[PDB]
A paper describes a structure:
Endoplasmic reticulum–associated degradation ([name]) maintains protein homeostasis by retrieving misfolded proteins from the endoplasmic reticulum (ER) lumen into the cytosol for degradation. Transitional ER adenosine triphosphatase (ATPase) ([name]/p97 in vertebrates and Cdc48 in yeast) was identified as the primary energy supplier for [name] and has been shown to power the defolding of ubiquitinated proteins via its interactions with the heterodimer Ufd1-Npl4 (11–14) and the deglycosylation through its interaction with N-glycanase 1 (15, 16). In humans, [name], a homolog of yeast [name], was found to form a tetrameric channel with a central tunnel ~10 Å wide, indicating a protein channel mechanism for retrotranslocation.
Hence, for the subsequent EM analysis in this study, we used the constructs of [name]Δ215–239 and p97Δ1–20, herein referred to as DerΔ-p97Δ. The DerΔ-p97Δ heterodecameric complex consists of six p97 molecules and four [name] molecules, with a molecular weight above 0.6 MDa. However, the C6 symmetry of p97 and the C2 symmetry of [name] (8, 20, 33) is disrupted within the DerΔ-p97Δ complex. As the stoichiometry of [name] and p97 within the decamer is unequal ([name]:p97 = 4:6), only four of the six p97 protomers (p97A–D) have their NTDs bound with [name], and the NTDs of the remaining two protomers (p97E and p97F) are unoccupied. In response, the four p97 NTDs bound with the [name] tetramer adopt different conformations to accommodate the tilted [name] tetramer, with the NTDs of p97A/B in the down position as in conformation I and the NTDs of p97C/D lifted to an up position to match the long distance between p97 and [name]γ/δ, with the NTD of p97C at a “higher” position and p97D at a slightly “lower” position than the NTDs of p97 in conformation III. Despite the atypical geometry of the DerΔ-p97Δ complex, these two channels are connected to a large cavity between [name] and p97 (D-P cavity) to form a long, continuous [name] substrate pathway extending from the ER lumen to the opening at the C-terminal surface of p97. Additionally, the binding pockets of the remaining ATPase catalytic centers (all D2 domains and the D1 domains of p97C/D) were largely empty, with only some discontinuous residual densities.
Residue numbers in the entry:
A (entry chain F): 22 to 776
B (entry chain D): 283 to 764
C (entry chain E): 283 to 413
The structure:
């Protein structure tokens, strides 16, 4: 019977929309916008409009809460969908309001609610259905008790709707559709998917897990930077799946006068057991169960013990699930991680790039953005921001836009005109001004993201390209071959070469090509942990790297520590010992099954301690040569691609004269010409302005002042200031070390011995 | 304290019974850890109630704690808690038994071989294994999918009628496994046998003379007035497989093996020094007999020599503690200590004294037949095909350690993988170019680990060890010879 | 706690108000400084009452303090105190205006050189100039 569909949580909040997958439409020959009949329990029927959505699975039907209550069904059940091609345009529809929704209004229901809701909607409606219409503050639920024709009818412009009479009573099924959904969460795709996987099944089907004897999770710790909107995620999940979300705040359990505080907690838990499938949310967990050494009195210990005893008291009983939020996974008491208590941890990281866009596209819903607004550019230029910061930025941009045009909207008051204020299309200047006066919150925080650097940016270094290809791509793409052959992949690679070049660019390019997270570690923070705390920091860095597997960890300037060891200090060697030993010990404990690569780059190889260069640690050594011809041309093209044009010069000629030049020097050479262009353009503008003040309106017509192009003469002007960044002796030392290493692998070939 | 007194009084009234106290550290931590006065009152009440068990009834009190140092030493006097039992992390057999116990109600498929499944779970406990089983079942469920079905009020039977768990489920669960042991020492009888290593008849003879004899036949030792040697120090070129020798002799002696590495030794300089050494040697003693193994013993001096000259104090601290701890050993327990190093001339002379590490054994590089045997040990793999002779492979590889041979063996598999993957990609491309040209599933290229693969792999043969080291070691040996 | 609460609902029931909490560091100090137990309760009460400003509210809360390190970090999340303004020490010109307002009631002579005084008073605040 390939006609039924299993209901699932939907995204669209409209009362008459259902989301279907394309194979279902192809199988049932259902078009877009047609009326379909849905049947559930209690012999109830409803009419819906088919809408396209590729997110939903073929077997699952996305269908909202209002029709879910109309059909007297719950999520996870099965409904019957059939085509309804016999629908006819309605003649008259009689609707009545519920008694406990019109309390204290005293107004025209038709003009405020019915007319805007039924305008250009063509909603098919049926007798006995409940539909919810939003208003100023409340949401009014209306019931169709009479229709013509019955039971199926289509709202049409020539339809008489009556809304006069005594309101009907409550339907005892709450017939509601409200509050947040999945559309209000952005930039958390992976985390939201993970939360859905392990929370939906124990709640939607409270017996299938018991059939296989799978223990559902009994506690989930969502930890991340503050302000990311974890409470919103929990509320959306609870409201979508269907539960009794009971938020208990942190400080509210501490302001009470001692004893009764504990009682409150106890009450909450029992208050959450009668209602069946409930999701308790303990916000600000660190404020009531902090680190043990922070505690100084006795009440906090009693509260912690009470919480632990109750949490162990959730053994079986109902399907209640405990979700707690904190800041970092080391501030809470270390005793709240024993099996049975909080054991699953989810990292809600800082949104990056693409995700940020959706956040803005959520906030700029009602506001009418101008055509000149480029939200993609705003998302790209803004980094280190969280949802709260972006919301505040949008709010202050709107405030600036309305402040500029104050007198045009009758600055006094007088029932502010909606169209006039809506005409305030926010401009790009407003967004830039808001960006200038906006202090972010993330700032100093490690960022995990997928880089966008591609291989064509660098020349390619086809030998090194193939070597890194073999080292990285194959283990993750095809691990079946490795497990068949039993070979254990290499875990570390060490680069060496002249300073600058393309180390970081190569690492980011291979990380992008492998489609894996990237983490950048630099020398200054290495020396930061050198001067003091040297054990923990590396530990949580490695746990963070492991948690987001697969990833390509990068250690930049690993030799820097040694640079501190060899000098006139002779005091921090203990710190270097601490750092190196911690790094080596943590690499030794890294299981080979987890795909966490480690790439370290050192400018001076032979100073580093030969302890690292041993099996089980960074094994392969790769020499990165200076860019030559083709790589130089690629770097120059990438640099010039940013904005200006150079359609007057020969690039391979410049590459010919620039032998022995590193990539950074080429970037500086490209940058100098732009400064020359800026100076010439500004001086020309000043000359034009001065000759304009000498004779008013001297150039009435705006001619072609120097437009963007880097002319040839600018290229000689910039190139005259060129530096040989690296001296030849550095190349001599690098090649001498390379040949010293290579001479080990020297043997007089082979002759197929006795085969 | 009223509840505790009531519990003890009730247990007194109801015949010989067992009282279990869970999380004893939560109620009786160290005295100086305690801050207020309620904790001290509770601890003293517990002490008094414990001391009040004179006769009374046949009541036995059993308590569980995580670490043996968190307990207030007041709860260690005779009459109070005096017998200690350590429930260590289960070994491979224990993991297999736990997996057998948990995978009872689950209807598995006829494709499960839990041997390597337990083998690949180094560092897990019972709860982690149960979570892994649940995750595997959960993948079984989500791969089945609730594709428009009517599991209402009959869900359990309707799903249990036909379900199974396959290899891919357990593989995923192994990927999504976060072990809880990790940073924790391991004690278990090793598995490496004498066949794994190659030759070295004299070293094996000496090791079995100094290890196997005093444990299997201690009566003759006592009759003849024997004090067996307590320590042996291995020295030689690096990468010769000293740890293999130690593990093999431990396996032959059927004694537990405990390993301590270099980085941990250097880490113990800065911060906790007394506690770690004390607890590790106590743990070695309690699990007698055991062969305690120290790796990279010379690294201490390797940090002393440099432009810093500040870590020498902590190095002397650790070495002093270790020396004082060996001097306290007793012949009662068969505790054996083995040290390994590659730079013996920088070892402090205080170590090489009677009672401490005295016997020195030089480990020569594998030669001729030993190279054949180590390759044969490496010759297992899964995909060895039929291969070729190896005597001249040993003949050509004079002066090559085990690490170089392992690298040479590993490089050939890399070339084979590259060949197989490039062939597969070319085949996939030609499938796109010509549809339906490979309707029949033609067999993929076999594991052709062929002569040419080895020939190209061992073209990059590295002389990892130099030549002057051998004369240095033989000069040191001649210095020993008198 | 009763006084602070009563002040909050008293400000709630009257008009758009501006509650000014003076010397905030005296009641919400650094975590390590909170040796007692009453301070934690007062801080929690303040946080809860601050968060109890649900949407419909005309109350704006302003606070005064020294360098923004003595204030406990939990008071600087989103929803609580978020906007910060630095009232720096006035410069020579600012000192000139401070002298100007402070001397409007005063009857000065014809030898007064307010510009020189403003120039020479580097390192002073309004109270010092008033004194
Ligand atoms: N789609 C979204 N993704 C992430 N954050 C959001 C989104 N929409 C709103 N937010 C932010 O969530 C905040 C509210 O969540 P909050 O109660 O602060 O949770 P928490 O206290 O866990 O940070 C708002 O300030 C808003 O800026």
């Amino acid at each position: 019977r390939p006609n039924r569909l299993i209901v699932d949580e939907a995204i669209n909040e409209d009362n008459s929309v259902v989301s279907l997958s394309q194979p279902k439409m192809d199988e049932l020959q259902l078009f877009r916008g047609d009326t379909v009949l849905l049947k559930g329990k209690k012999r109830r029927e409803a009419v819906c409009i088919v809408l396209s959505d590729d997110t939903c699975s073929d077997e699952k039907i996305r269908m909202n809460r209002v029709v879910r209550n109309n059909l007297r069904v719950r999520l996870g059940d099965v409904i019957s969908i059939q085509p309804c091609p016999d629908v006819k345009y309605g003649k008259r529809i009689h609707v009545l309001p519920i008694d406990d929704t019109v309390e204290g209004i005293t107004g025209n229901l038709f003009e405020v609610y019915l007319k805007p809701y039924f305008l250009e909607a063509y909603r098919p409606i049926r007798k006995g259905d409940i539909f919810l219409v939003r208003g100023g503050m409340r949401a009014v639920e209306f019931k169709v008790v009479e229709t013509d024709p019955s039971p199926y009818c289509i709202v049409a412009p020539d339809t008489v709707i009556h809304c006069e009479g005594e309101p009907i009573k409550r339907e005892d099924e709450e017939e509601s559709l409200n509050e947040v959904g999945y559309d209000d969460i952005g930039g958390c795709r992976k985390q939201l998917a993970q939360i859905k996987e392990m929370v939906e099944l124990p709640l939607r089907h409270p017996a299938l897990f018991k059939a296989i004897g799978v223990k559902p999770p009994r506690g989930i710790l969502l930890y991340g930077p503050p302000g990311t909107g974890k409470t919103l995620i929990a509320r959306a999940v609870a409201n979508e799946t269907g539960a009794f979300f009971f938020l208990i705040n942190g400080p509210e359990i501490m302001s009470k006068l001692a004893g009764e505080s504990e009682s409150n907690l106890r009450k909450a838990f029992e208050e959450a057991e009668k209602n069946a499938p409930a999701i308790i949310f303990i916000d600000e967990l660190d404020a009531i169960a902090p680190k043990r050494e922070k505690t100084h009195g006795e009440v906090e210990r009693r509260i912690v013990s009470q919480l632990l005893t109750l949490m162990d008291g959730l053994k079986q009983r109902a399907h209640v699930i405990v979700m707690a939020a904190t800041n970092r996974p080391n501030s809470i008491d270390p005793a709240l991680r024993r099996f049975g208590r909080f054991d699953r941890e989810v990292d809600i990281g800082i949104p990056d790039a693409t995700g940020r866009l959706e956040i803005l596209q959520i906030h700029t819903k009602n506001m009418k953005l101008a055509d000149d607004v480029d939200l993609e550019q705003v998302a790209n230029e803004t980094h280190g921001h969280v949802g709260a910061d972006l919301a505040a930025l949008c709010s202050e941009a709107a405030l600036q836009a309305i402040r500029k045009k104050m007198d045009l909207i009758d600055l006094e008051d007088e029932t502010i005109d909606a169209e006039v204020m809506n005409s305030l299309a926010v401009t790009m200047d407003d967004f830039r001004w808001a960006l200038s006066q906006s202090n972010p919150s993330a700032l100093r925080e490690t960022v995990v993201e997928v880089p966008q650097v591609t291989w064509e940016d660098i020349g390619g270094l086809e030998d090194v390209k193939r070597e890194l290809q073999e080292l990285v791509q194959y283990p993750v793409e095809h691990p079946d071959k490795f497990l068949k052959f039993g070979m254990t992949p290499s875990k570390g690679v060490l680069f060496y070469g002249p300073p600058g070049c393309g180390k970081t660019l190569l690492a980011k390019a291979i990380a992008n090509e492998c489609q894996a997270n990237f983490i950048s570690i630099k020398g200054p923070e290495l020396l930061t942990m050198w001067f003091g705390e040297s054990e923990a920091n590396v530990r949580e860095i490695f746990d963070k790297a492991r948690q987001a597997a697969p990833c390509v960890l990068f250690f930049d300037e690993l030799d820097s520590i040694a640079k501190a060891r060899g000098g006139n200090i002779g005091d921090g060697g203990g710190a270097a010992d601490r750092v190196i030993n911690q790094i080596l010990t943590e690499m030794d404990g890294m299981s080979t099954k987890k795909n966490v690569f480690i790439i370290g780059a050192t400018n001076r190889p032979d100073i580093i301690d030969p302890a690292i260069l041993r099996p089980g640690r960074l094994d392969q050594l790769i020499y990165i040569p200076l860019p030559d011809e083709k790589s130089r041309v690629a770097i120059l093209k990438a640099n010039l691609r940013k904005s200006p044009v150079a359609k007057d010069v020969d690039l391979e000629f410049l590459a010919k004269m620039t032998n022995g030049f590193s990539g950074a020097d080429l970037t500086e050479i490209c940058q100098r010409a732009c400064k020359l262009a800026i100076r010439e353009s500004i001086e020309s503008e000043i000359r034009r302005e001065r000759e304009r003040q000498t004779n008013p309106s001297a150039m009435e017509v705006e001619e072609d002042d120097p437009v963007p192009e880097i002319r040839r003469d600018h290229f000689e002007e910039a190139m005259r200031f060129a530096r040989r960044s690296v001296s030849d002796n550095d190349i001599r030392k690098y090649e001498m070390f390379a040949q010293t290493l290579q001479q080990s692998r020297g043997f007089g070939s082979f002759r197929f011995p006795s085969g």
